[PDB]
C-alpha cells in the first residue's frame, strides 16, 4: 500500500504495455532510462498514483522522447520530443558499448594504427567512453562514444595492464560511423601482466587468517515490512532503488517517545563525476559521470553472502527495465544488516562509584557497482545516537596509460612503462531535508577566535558564529576546515525543551573540490563539484545537480540554473546538495588491483533531542 514501495516486475511490464499501446515503443525504440517517480507534495493523498518516468531512444535516428506514465491508471501523462543538441543526449545504452570495438575493428585508420604497434586486432579491447562536449562541431546532436584501447593477451587477461597510448577514436553509435581516429604516436604497450588471481603474481596464499564469525542467534534487530520499509532502534525509513541514483533513502525519521519525528525526506547520491587530470589529447576529454551518463544502479553487483556482506544479512533484489522495457531483477543487489560499533558511552565516576558502559551499533544499507575499470560501494549508516552517515568505498582497477619516458606531472608510474593518470571521484549528496517537518533553514557555523583583552584578559576565550542562509543566491558555500566550518539544518518553528530550534549538524571531510580550471568544459558541466555546499528551495523537477540529460550536454542546466531563481530558503522546504570527493594520485600499492579508499560525510543531532537519546540502551 506504501507509495514508496520498490518498483515491481509487474509495474515495469505494465509501463512497457502502456507505452506500446500509445504507439511510443515500437521496434526501433529503446528505453535508456526508467524509474518510478516520488509522490508529489501532498498529505491529502490518493489511494495511490504510481507514476514512471521514461527516456526513450530511437535507433533509427528519430528524436528521443521523455515520457511520464501512470501505471495505476494506464495512461500516458505526458510525452515530449527532445532536442538533444540543446538539452542533452540520453544516457549511454548498455548495448552501444559493444558497437565501438566492433566498428573500429573494420576501420582502415584503426587497423593501420594497430598494425603500427604490431597489435592483433582480435586481442584489442576498446573502452567505450562518454564523449563530453569539446571542439568537434560535427558531434552536436549526435550520439558519440570515444574509444581507448587495451590489449588482452588471452580471454582472462586483465587488459588494463596493457594500455595502448597515443591512440583514440570517436564513433557515432547510431549511424555506425567512425568519425575520427587520432594517432599521436606509438608508445610501448606495457608488457607486465596485472592478473591478481595468478599464483606467479600473488605468491602462495596466506594460511595465517583465522575465521571471524559474526552471527545473530535471535536474528536481526530490524524489521522489514511492505517490501522495503525499515524499522530499527527507533529509526524509520523506506529503502528505494533507482537505476540512475542507485539506493535512495526515503522518509528517514526517528521515534522520540510517542512522536515519529522526520529528519530527512529523501537522501541520495544525485551525481558522481570522475574527471581526469592528464592534459594528453588521448585522455584530456575524459570525464565519467558515473551516475548521470552511465546510470550506476544498472551496474549494481549481485552481492554474495560471506564475501560482500558478512553477518546476518537481509537482501533486497530491486527490479529495473532492460532496453526493451522488460523487467530485470538485480538479485541480492542491496545488503541490509546491523553491526556492532564499539563503545557508545562510558564513564567511571570517582565520587559516585558508578562505572557505566554501553555499546554502539549501526544499521547498514549498501550496494556495490562497477563502471569499467573501477568499482564503488555505497554505504548508508544509521547510529543509535541519531547520527546519519554516508560512506563511499572506491576500489577496482585503476584506469591506465603509458608512463612517459621522462616522467610526468599528471601521471604516476605503477609498473615498468605503466602509467595512472591523476583524477578525482566527486560525489553530490542530495539531501531533501525535513528536520521535524518541512519548515527548515540552514546556518553556516564557524569557530570564532577571540583576541586577548578586556572581557578576555587571559586570552583563553573562543566562541562560534552562525549565519542563516536566507536566499539561494547566498547559499553556495565553501569548506573552511581551519575554522571548523559546518552547516546546521534547523526547524525555526520546532524547539527543544531549552527553547532552541531543533537541528542537525552536517560534518564534511573537507576534501579538495573540483581542481579543473574554472574555464574548462568539465568545470561548466560539473559546476556542482566546484563548491562544497548548495542549498535550494525544493522543486519537483530539480532532481540532479547536473540536470536530466548529462550525456554530451554543455552547461546550462543543473544547480547553477536552479540557484539563479534566488528563492526564499529561510524556514521553507529546502534541499541540501553536498559535494565531496577523493583526489587520487595513484600509488604503486593501487596496482594490480586497488585496496579500498573511502570518503563521505555525516550528520549529527544538534539540540534535536532534549537529552541523550540513548539513555534507554541496556547493558546486556
* Stretch near ligand O=CCc1ccccc1 under the rule CB under 6 A, chosen from 49-57, 125-133, 171-179, 554-562: 125-133
CA dist., res. 579 & res. 601, Å (int): 10
CA dist., res. 264 & res. 386, Å (int): 12
| Minimum distance of ligand O=CCc1ccccc1 from residue 590's CB (angstroms) | 17
Phi, psi of 291 (to 5 degrees): -75, -55
91 binds a copy of itself (CB under 8 A): no
Supply the residues annotated as catalytic: 290, 374
Which of 309, 305, 300, 375 lies closest to 330 in space, CA to CA? 300
Site string for ligand O=CCc1ccccc1, 74-113 (x = CB under 6 A): -----------------------x----------------
Phi, psi of 143 (to 5 degrees): -90, 110
Q: Where are the alpha helices (H) located in 237-371, listed in sequence order? A: none
Q: Which of 68, 87, 510, 572 binds a copy of itself (CB under 8 A)?
A: 510
Closer residue to a copy of itself, CB minimum distance, 71 or 516: 516
| Cell of residue 34, nine digits | 526508467
Name residues contacting Cu ion, limited to 569-598 (CB under 5 A): 584
The residue of the chain with the least Cβ separation from ligand O=CCc1ccccc1 equals 372
CA dist., res. 457 & res. 71, Å (int): 71
Closer residue to Cu ion, CB minimum distance, 174 or 344: 344
Peptide bond before residue 126 is cis, with ω within 30 degrees of 0: no
128 binds ligand O=CCc1ccccc1 (CB under 6 A): yes
CA dist., res. 23 & res. 333, Å (int): 33
Cβ distance 321 to 295 under 8 Å? no
Closer residue to ligand O=CCc1ccccc1, CB minimum distance, 160 or 241: 160
Which residues 6+ apart lie within 8 Å of 563 measured at CB? 472, 473, 475, 476, 534, 536
Closer residue to Cu ion, CB minimum distance, 559 or 582: 582
**How far are the Cα atoms of 148, 244, 395 from residue 372, in angstroms, in the given order?**
12, 16, 12
351 binds ligand O=CCc1ccccc1 (CB under 6 A): yes
371 binds ligand O=CCc1ccccc1 (CB under 6 A): yes
Which residues 6+ apart lie within 8 Å of 427 measured at CB? 269, 271, 272, 392, 579, 580, 581, 599
| Minimum distance of a copy of itself from residue 124's CB (angstroms) | 11
Q: Which of 351, 405, 406, 540 binds a copy of itself (CB under 8 A)?
A: 351
Name residues contacting a copy of itself, limited to 313-332 (CB under 8 A): none
| Cell of residue 187, nine digits | 608508445
| Minimum distance of Cu ion from residue 422's CB (angstroms) | 9
| Cell of residue 200, nine digits | 606467479
| Minimum distance of a copy of itself from residue 88's CB (angstroms) | 20
CA dist., res. 394 & res. 402, Å (int): 23
Binding site partner of 371, from Cu ion, a copy of itself, ligand O=CCc1ccccc1, none, Cβ cut-off 5-8 A by kind? ligand O=CCc1ccccc1
| Cell of residue 309, nine digits | 556482506
154 binds ligand O=CCc1ccccc1 (CB under 6 A): no
Binding site partner of 73, from a copy of itself, ligand O=CCc1ccccc1, Cu ion, none, Cβ cut-off 5-8 A by kind? none
Between vectors from CA 500 to CA 497 and to CA 501, what angle results, nearest 5°? 110
| Minimum distance of ligand O=CCc1ccccc1 from residue 372's CB (angstroms) | 2
Name residues contacting a copy of itself, limited to 398-437 (CB under 8 A): 409-410, 413, 415-416, 422
Closer residue to ligand O=CCc1ccccc1, CB minimum distance, 150 or 609: 150
CA dist., res. 501 & res. 397, Å (int): 47
Which run of H or of E encompasses 115?
Answer: helix 108-116
| Minimum distance of a copy of itself from residue 67's CB (angstroms) | 30
54 binds ligand O=CCc1ccccc1 (CB under 6 A): no
Which run of H or of E encompasses 263?
Answer: strand 259-275
| Minimum distance of ligand O=CCc1ccccc1 from residue 128's CB (angstroms) | 5
Q: Is 201 left (phi over 0), alpha (psi -120 to 50) or beta?
A: alpha
Q: How many C-alpha atoms does 103 have within 13 Å on its Cβ side? A: 24
| Minimum distance of a copy of itself from residue 304's CB (angstroms) | 7
385 binds a copy of itself (CB under 8 A): yes
Binding site partner of 584, from a copy of itself, Cu ion, ligand O=CCc1ccccc1, none, Cβ cut-off 5-8 A by kind? Cu ion
Question: What SS3 state is found at 560?
Answer: helix
CA dist., res. 294 & res. 369, Å (int): 11
Enumerate the β-bridge partners of residue 79.
67
Closer residue to a copy of itself, CB minimum distance, 81 or 478: 478
372 binds ligand O=CCc1ccccc1 (CB under 6 A): yes
Binding site partner of 407, from ligand O=CCc1ccccc1, Cu ion, a copy of itself, none, Cβ cut-off 5-8 A by kind? none
| Minimum distance of a copy of itself from residue 21's CB (angstroms) | 35
Residues of this chain that interact with ligand O=CCc1ccccc1 (CB under 6 A) are: 97, 127-129, 350-351, 371-373
Residues that bind Cu ion (CB under 5 A): 584
Amino acid at each position: 500500500a506504501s507509495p514508496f514501495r520498490l518498483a515491481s516486475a509487474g509495474e515495469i511490464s505494465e509501463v512497457q504495455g502502456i507505452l506500446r499501446t500509445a504507439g511510443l515503443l515500437g521496434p526501433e525504440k529503446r528505453i535508456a532510462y526508467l524509474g518510478v517517480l516520488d509522490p508529489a507534495r501532498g498529505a491529502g493523498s490518493e489511494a495511490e498514483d504510481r507514476r514512471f518516468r521514461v527516456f526513450i531512444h530511437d535507433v533509427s535516428g528519430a528524436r528521443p522522447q521523455e515520457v511520464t506514465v501512470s501505471v495505476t491508471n494506464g495512461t500516458v501523462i505526458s510525452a515530449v520530443e527532445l532536442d538533444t543538441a540543446a538539452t542533452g543526449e540520453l544516457p549511454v545504452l548498455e548495448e552501444e558499448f559493444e558497437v565501438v570495438e566492433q566498428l573500429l575493428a573494420t576501420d582502415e585508420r584503426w587497423l593501420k594504427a594497430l598494425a603500427a604497434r604490431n597489435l592483433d586486432v582480435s586481442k584489442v579491447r576498446v573502452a567505450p567512453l562518454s564523449a563530453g562536449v569539446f571542439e568537434y562541431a560535427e558531434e552536436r546532436g549526435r550520439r558519440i562514444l570515444r574509444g581507448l584501447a587495451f590489449v588482452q593477451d588471452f580471454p582472462e587477461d586483465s587488459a588494463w595492464a596493457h594500455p595502448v597510448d597515443g591512440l583514440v577514436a570517436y564513433v557515432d553509435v547510431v549511424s555506425k560511423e567512425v568519425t575520427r581516429v587520432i594517432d599521436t604516436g606509438v608508445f610501448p604497450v606495457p608488457a607486465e601482466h596485472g592478473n591478481y588471481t595468478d599464483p606467479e603474481l600473488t605468491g602462495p596464499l596466506r594460511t595465517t587468517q583465522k575465521p571471524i564469525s559474526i552471527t545473530q542467534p535471535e536474528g536481526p534487530s530490524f524489521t522489514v515490512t511492505g517490501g522495503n520499509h525499515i524499522e530499527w532502534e527507533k529509526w524509520s525509513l523506506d529503502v528505494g532503488f533507482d537505476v540512475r541514483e542507485g539506493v535512495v533513502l526515503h522518509n528517514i525519521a526517528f521515534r522520540d517517545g510517542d512522536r515519529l519525528r522526520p529528519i530527512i525526506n529523501r537522501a541520495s547520491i544525485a551525481e558522481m563525476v570522475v574527471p581526469y587530470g592528464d592534459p594528453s589529447p588521448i585522455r584530456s576529454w575524459q570525464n565519467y559521470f558515473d551516475t548521470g551518463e552511465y546510470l550506476v544502479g544498472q551496474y549494481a553487483n549481485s552481492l554474495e553472502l560471506g564475501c560482500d556482506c558478512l553477518g546476518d544479512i537481509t537482501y533486497l533484489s530491486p527490479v529495473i527495465s532492460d532496453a526493451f522495457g522488460n523487467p530485470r531483477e538485480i538479485r541480492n543487489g542491496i545488503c541490509m544488516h546491523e553491526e556492532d560499533w564499539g563503545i557508545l558511552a562510558k564513564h567511571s565516576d570517582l565520587w559516585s562509584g558508578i562505572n557505566y558502559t554501553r555499546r554502539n551499533r549501526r544499521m547498514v544499507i549498501s550496494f556495490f557497482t562497477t563502471i569499467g575499470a573501477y568499482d564503488y560501494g555505497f554505504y548508508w549508516y544509521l547510529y543509535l545516537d541519531g547520527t546519519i552517515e554516508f560512506e563511499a568505498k572506491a576500489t577496482g582497477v585503476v584506469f591506465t596509460s603509458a608512463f612517459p619516458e621522462g616522467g610526468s606531472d599528471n601521471i604516476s608510474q605503477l609498473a615498468p612503462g605503466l602509467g595512472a593518470p591523476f583524477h578525482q571521484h566527486i560525489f553530490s549528496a542530495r539531501l531533501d531535508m525535513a528536520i521535524d517537518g518541512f519548515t527548515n533553514r540552514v546556518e553556516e557555523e564557524d569557530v570564532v577566535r577571540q583576541t586577548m583583552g578586556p572581557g578576555n584578559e587571559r586570552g583563553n576565550a573562543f566562541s562560534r558564529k552562525r549565519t542563516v542562509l536566507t536566499r539561494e543566491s547566498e547559499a553556495v558555500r565553501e569548506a573552511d576546515a581551519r575554522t571548523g566550518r559546518t552547516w546546521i539544518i534547523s526547524n525555526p518553528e520546532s524547539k527543544n525543551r531549552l527553547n532552541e530550534p531543533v537541528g542537525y549538524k552536517l560534518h564534511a571531510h573537507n576534501q579538495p573540490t573540483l581542481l579543473a580550471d574554472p574555464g574548462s568544459s568539465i568545470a561548466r558541466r560539473a559546476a556542482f563539484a566546484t563548491k562544497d555546499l548548495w542549498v535550494t528551495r525544493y522543486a519537483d523537477d530539480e532532481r540532479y545537480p547536473t540536470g536530466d540529460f548529462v550525456n554530451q550536454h554543455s552547461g546550462g542546466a543543473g544547480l547553477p540554473s536552479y540557484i539563479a531563481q534566488d528563492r526564499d530558503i529561510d524556514g521553507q522546504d529546502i534541499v541540501v546538495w553536498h559535494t565531496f570527493g577523493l583526489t587520487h594520485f595513484p600509488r604503486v600499492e593501487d596496482w594490480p588491483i586497488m585496496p579500498v579508499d573511502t570518503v563521505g560525510f555525516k550528520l549529527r543531532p544538534e539540540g534535536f533531542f532534549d537529552r541523550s537519546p540513548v539513555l534507554d540502551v541496556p547493558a546486556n
